[PDB]
Ligand binder design. Structure first.
Ligand code: ANP
Ligand code: MG
Length: 285
């Protein structure tokens, strides 16, 4: 079902790539590593369109095949916890990617309760963290590295199933430091870097706090692990007060996983399968 789109159909579907925000009449959902992301409706499906690069800038045939083979891998990585890539476009001015629109947005927006949405229950946050780990495991099982794990790249479908997004885009970008591992900051590429970033997301899930805040002590959310180990604060102090069903036992279970993930030595962190085990045992009975 993965196919190509005419750049001029995507133009119509996005109201001529209306860069205005949706709230004022446009189609802009946001912007990240590859500029504006546009919302549209095509083939009886609400979609998210992402403009990678310009077709003129893809000059050499090596750059053409560097993106063709890169998109082949993305289109093949289909899983319950991965955003489905519907297609692409190359016949026009810009190289585009068409993803399935996730109606509940990103985990980042729901943790901050953007647009008046209700806060996620602790029961849902556990199922979301488990699904995200299942999606990361699918990538690692097939020898892939996401390289850009963060709450903004964990989307939620109609049933609040976790859908990892933007896989391979960081790979194509090299062809947001608050989530990156120490070895990732130094340029090292390893699936153990994803485990570290997933640990930061778990802290966001527990606290409902963003990974970085300029007017906050500490500024980086990953630094609160030092406050817990030094007995300056407890995990109970940081628990999202907007939850109504949190229990200290399972919360400390998820924090124990987040702690192991945030080991500075990449060999001390568990693999994604151990993360799956601990997250599944967290809700066992
Ligand atoms: N398929 C999608 N469905 C719904 N929302 C999406 C989808 N893809 C991206 N978004 C959201 O749209 C916004 C723009 O996406 P994006 O350009 O990826 O920014 P970003 O994720 O914050 N930074 P980055 O992913 O590293 O480029 C973010 O709030 C995303 O969570
Ligand atoms: Mg993203």
């Amino acid at each position: 079902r993965f196919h190509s789109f005419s750049f001029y159909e995507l133009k119509n579907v996005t109201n001529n790539f209306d860069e205005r925000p949706i709230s004022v009449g446009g189609n802009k959902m946001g912007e990240g590593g590859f500029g504006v992301v546009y919302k549209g409706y095509v083939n009886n499906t609400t979609v998210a369109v992402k403009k990678l690069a310009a077709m003129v800038d893809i000059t050499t045939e090596e750059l053409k095949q560097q993106f063709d083979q890169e998109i082949k891998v993305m289109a093949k990585c289909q899983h319950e916890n991965l955003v489905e890539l519907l297609g692409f476009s190359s016949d026009g001015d810009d190289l585009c990617l068409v993803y399935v629109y996730m109606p509940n947005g990103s985990l980042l927006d729901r943790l901050s309760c953007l647009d008046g949405t209700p806060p996620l229950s602790w029961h849902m946050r556990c199922k979301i963290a488990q699904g995200a780990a299942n999606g990361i495991n699918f990538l690692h099982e097939n020898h892939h590295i996401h390289r850009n794990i963060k709450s903004a790249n964990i989307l939620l479908d109609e049933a609040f199933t976790a859908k990892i997004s933007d896989f391979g885009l960081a790979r194509a970008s090299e062809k947001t430091t608050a989530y990156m591992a120490p070895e990732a900051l130094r340029g090292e590429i390893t699936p153990k870097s994803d485990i570290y970033s997933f640990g930061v997301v778990l802290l966001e899930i527990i606290t409902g706090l963003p990974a970085v805040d300029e007017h906050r002590e500490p500024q980086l959310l990953l630094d609160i692990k030092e406050e817990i180990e030094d007995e300056e604060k407890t995990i109970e102090d940081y628990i999202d007060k907007k939850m109504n069903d949190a229990d200290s036992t399972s919360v400390e279970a998820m924090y124990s996983v987040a702690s192991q993930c945030l080991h500075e030595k990449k060999n001390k962190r568990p693999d994604i399968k151990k993360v799956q085990q601990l997250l599944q045992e967290m809700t066992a009975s």
